[PDB]
Design a protein around this ligand. Sequence first.
Ligand code: NAG
Lengths: 49, 49
Amino acid sequence: ITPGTNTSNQVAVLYQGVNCTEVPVAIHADQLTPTWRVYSTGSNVFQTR
Amino acid sequence: AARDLICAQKFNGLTVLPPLLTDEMIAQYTSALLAGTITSGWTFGAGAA
Ligand SMILES: *[C@@H]1O[C@H](CO)[C@@H](O)[C@H](O)[C@H]1NC(C)=O
């Protein structure tokens, strides 16, 4: 989720159809495909349907 | 999982996205339409109720 890059570089990330408790947090870079990490607990976490 | 086709669909990359409007919101829209109709006739469709 982004506003325009003409507005900000901040983004939000929606992990679709998963519970926030099962959201993938992987300290190692070879145990998950998305290599970037957005800190689940650190950043704001909300659970939508 | 064995007794559910949804789990097989999900496991093979086929998912369902939720509608933007919930059923409660749609029911609110219909109740607003009904209230407008029975209190103001057709006036609320053309301007103020
Ligand atoms: C997420 O997991 C917790 C614990 O397993 C559960 O109580 C909760 O209902 C789950 N989230 C949703 C939206 O159901």
